[PDB]
């Protein structure tokens, strides 16, 4: 088993800009073969042995975003300062 | 006496972008001769008879801002819109 990863339950929601339904992050991370335990608002994710690419929370964010479909991510313009 | 004017207690703070000390708006408006009464977070300002120019909250904002001095207003570039 690779080392466990600690990540907030709403981290994929923040990076995607989408409010995913309840339990979406835990369910998708369990589908790809990882074991997820709940510690309040923080998830402890241990990726499966066949997924050594999952080392940081960003690696887990890509798993949720790609399985939920990148088409659900809205289109908002960033707040760029005066150049 | 001209009709009374209602505006928020922090309206001059918002228009100026400066967090004035508490009681600044009420002190300055009474200083120019207006009757100021308190109702929660809304000020009822009755300008004096020699100030018919004070008719709207914007007129009251000018009095607080000019007496406190426009030098305290910081230089904050607004975010660049997607032009
Ligand atoms: Mg990846
Ligand atoms: Mg004026």
UniProtKB/Swiss-Prot annotation, chains A, B:
The signal peptide here is: none
Residue stretches making up the B5 domain: 1-75
The UniProt annotation places Mg(2+) binding at: 53, 59, 62-63
Which cell locations does it reside in?
Answer: Cytoplasm
More info: Was identified as a high-confidence drug target.
Q: Member of which family?
A: Belongs to the phenylalanyl-tRNA synthetase beta subunit family. Type 1 subfamily.
Q: Subunit comment for this entry?
A: Tetramer of two alpha and two beta subunits.
- What's the name of the protein? Phenylalanine--tRNA ligase beta subunit
Species per Swiss-Prot/TrEMBL record: Mycobacterium tuberculosis (strain ATCC 25618 / H37Rv)
Species lineage: Bacteria, Bacillati, Actinomycetota, Actinomycetes, Mycobacteriales
Please state which portion of the whole protein this structure contains, as first and last residue out of the total length: 415 to 497 of 831
């Amino acid at each position: 088993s690779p080392p466990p990863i600690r990540m907030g339950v709403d981290v994929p929601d923040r990076i995607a800009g989408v409010a995913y339904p309840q339990g979406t992050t835990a369910r998708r991370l369990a589908q790809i073969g990882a074991v997820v335990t709940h510690d309040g608002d923080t998830l402890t994710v241990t990726p499966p042995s066949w997924r050594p690419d999952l080392r940081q929370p960003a690696d887990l964010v890509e798993e949720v975003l790609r399985l939920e479909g990148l088409e659900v991510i809205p289109s908002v313009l960033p707040p760029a300062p005066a150049g």
